[PDB]
């Protein structure tokens, strides 16, 4: 067995010193030979033997051994007699090994029969020289093999920047950007580093964007009906820039009435863009509603006040107006689902108005959690923390049904708690959750959740997927690709820090794999219209008989916010032709929000085709 990778591992103990030196449990995982876990010895009385050190791996690995690295500075607390326990579920534990280690500074190794475990506990019974009631350790490694499947990961893909915002383009290309710099941010320099990854060839084009005077770090994003991507606020808090995928260039838009950052933008049923909140930039507070049209620019909605969306963040309005969970709803309305406990109905006519939707059951505030629309008027919320900064994340998930009402229920908890994660609606109706960490501290990788999970509406259960290789915490992104795979990238963007990830990885979901790990034969779309109108009947030819399709709106994503994606399942009617079917698009543009969609054919095993692009008006 080689050592397992320790990304995301969290160490805790019976007792630990912090008064007389830094003896925290967490020091066994940092890789530094000079930093120790030491049992608590001050004040008197010192804590007595035995002492325990527990490791939560975040995942159910196969464990076949443990490596103990003693301190190098002196002999105090070198473990003598030892016990090793394992749990998969947290509650029942099993002995795998028991022994004694000699009184020297040599790294010790213990190997046993392979065991399925998320947790490994080391009990120290004696101090190898009986010098005192002490245990200590510089490093703990674990030997064995990580889970393979379900699903599979690509190798990492090199990026020339930290991809901290991202959008899917037609033609199987992915636009990403960072800030004025590939690896840091700040000021209002009016330049953004960008990179387009070609999903076919793996090639990356890098482009500095200076023509619109906009550093587009920390903005609101959405997809427009005509195909363009509107990006407003951020480091240049008043700017609007629009990206055209025909030209692959940016064009200046008009300024917002008030600058903002970390706000939420959402394309409405009319193809206008509504925005609310965002005190990260442009000033503190009063970040009330605005709406953009292409003919009139940004107009104020003074009767859409921010007060309704504010969480009880300890950081106040700087954080409490961040990253609202905004959705286009039937009828042309906007729905606010969170992260605040309080949910709202927003109307954009006139000066606007807000109506309370009541709370999200008994959820606490869920800042940096995800909300994902997996069907018509059906949303799944999950993860988040009551606070933006230094705050315990939750594993709780709540469903919300907004069809002719508001109906909230609590669903299954995730196997791990997450903040800073991303959510991705998949074509089969399931929802993937990716990344995040256990305790929200922006710019850290500590307690990163390495194994995505998949929620099946049919049973409301979460299933763990094969884990990825790079932690994806703050400033990470994930989104659906047209071949049905999921891109994950980014993390960090903190300058001389050691947590920048200038890469991504691509997840192949279980729906594309045979039991043996060979690629599943997929349905194929042979012919389909490239444009269509809400309420239209359209004709689709597949290469075999298909009766279920998914319209999946294309995504933009940053800082956990994705107002664009949504699943609209359609039932095919058979016609006279050879595996040619009719689909009927919903007439309601509140539901069928205009923009770029990926149309997917779903086979009887629920395997999806590669999608085709259809621009819906």
């Amino acid at each position: 067995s080689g050592p397992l990778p320790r990304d995301g591992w969290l160490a805790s103990a019976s007792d630990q010193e912090t008064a007389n030196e830094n003896g925290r449990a967490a020091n066994v995982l940092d890789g530094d030979a000079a930093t120790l876990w030491h049992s608590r010895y001050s004040p008197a009385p010192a804590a007595p033997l035995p002492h325990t050190l527990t490791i939560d791996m975040g995942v159910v690995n196969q464990v076949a051994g443990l490596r103990y690295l003693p301190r190098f500075d002196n002999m105090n607390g070198r473990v003598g007699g030892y016990s090793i326990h394992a749990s998969s579920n947290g509650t029942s534990w099993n002995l795998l090994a028991r022994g004694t280690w000699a009184d020297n500074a040599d790294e010790k190794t213990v190997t046993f029969a392979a065991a399925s475990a998320r947790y490994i506990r080391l009990t120290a019974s004696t101090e190898a020289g009986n010098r005192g009631p002490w245990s200590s350790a510089a490093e703990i490694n674990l030997l064995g093999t990580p889970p393979k499947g379900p699903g599979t990961w690509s190798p990492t893909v090199n990026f020339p920047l930290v991809p901290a915002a991202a959008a899917l383009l037609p033609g199987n290309r992915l636009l990403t950007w960072s800030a004025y710099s590939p690896i840091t941010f700040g000021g209002e320099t009016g330049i953004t580093q960008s990179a387009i990854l070609d999903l076919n060839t793996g090639a990356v084009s890098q482009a500095e964007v200076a023509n619109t005077g906009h550093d587009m770090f920390c903005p609101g994003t959405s997809l427009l009906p005509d195909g363009r991507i509107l990006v407003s606020g951020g480091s240049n808090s008043e700017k609007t820039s629009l990206f055209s995928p025909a030209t692959n260039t940016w064009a200046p838009g008009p300024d917002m009435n008030v600058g903002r950052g970390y706000q939420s933008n959402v394309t409405t049923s009319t193809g206008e863009v509504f925005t609310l909140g965002g005190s990260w930039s442009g000033g503190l507070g009063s970040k009330h509603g605005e709406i953009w049209s292409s003919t009139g620019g940004w107009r104020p909605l003074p009767d859409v006040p921010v007060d309704s969306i504010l969480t009880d963040d300890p950081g106040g309005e700087f954080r409490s107006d961040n990253h609202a969970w905004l959705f286009s709803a039937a009828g042309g309305r906007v729905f606010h689902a969170g992260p605040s406990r309080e949910m709202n109905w927003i109307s954009t006519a006139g000066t606007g108005s807000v109506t309370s939707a009541g709370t999200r059951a008994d959820s606490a505030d869920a800042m940096n959690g995800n909300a994902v629309m997996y069907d018509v008027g059906k949303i799944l919320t999950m993860g988040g923390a009551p606070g933006y900064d230094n705050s315990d994340a939750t594993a709780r998930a709540y469903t919300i049904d907004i069809n002719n009402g508001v109906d909230v229920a609590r669903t299954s908890d995730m196997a791990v708690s997450r903040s800073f994660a991303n959510g991705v609606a998949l074509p089969d109706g399931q929802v993937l959750v990716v990344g995040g960490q256990a305790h929200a501290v922006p710019f850290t990788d500590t307690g990163a959740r390495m194994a995505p999970e998949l929620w099946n509406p049919a049973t409301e259960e979460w299933t763990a997927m094969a884990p990825m290789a790079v932690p994806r915490t703050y400033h990470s992104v994930a989104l659906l690709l047209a071949d049905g795979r999921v891109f994950v990238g980014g993390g960090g963007l903190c300058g001389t820090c050691t947590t920048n990830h200038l890469d991504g990885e691509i997840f192949t979901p279980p729906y594309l794999l045979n039991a043996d790990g060979s690629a599943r034969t997929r349905p194929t779309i042979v012919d389909a219209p490239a444009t269509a109108t809400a309420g239209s009947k359209i004709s689709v030819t597949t290469g075999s008989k298909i009766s279920k399709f998914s319209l999946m709106r294309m995504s933009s994503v940053t800082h956990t916010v994705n107002t664009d994606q949504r699943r609209i399942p359609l039932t095919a009617t058979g016609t006279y032709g050879n595996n040619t079917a009719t689909l009927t698009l919903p007439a309601d543009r509140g539901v069928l929000v205009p923009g770029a969609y990926m149309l997917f054919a779903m086979d009887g095993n629920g395997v999806p085709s590669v999608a085709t692009t259809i621009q819906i008006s």
Binding site: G31, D32, A33, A34, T35
Partner: peptide
């Protein structure tokens, strides 16, 4: 591993 020193 690495070391920061004592």
């Amino acid at each position: 591993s690495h070391s920061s020193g004592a």
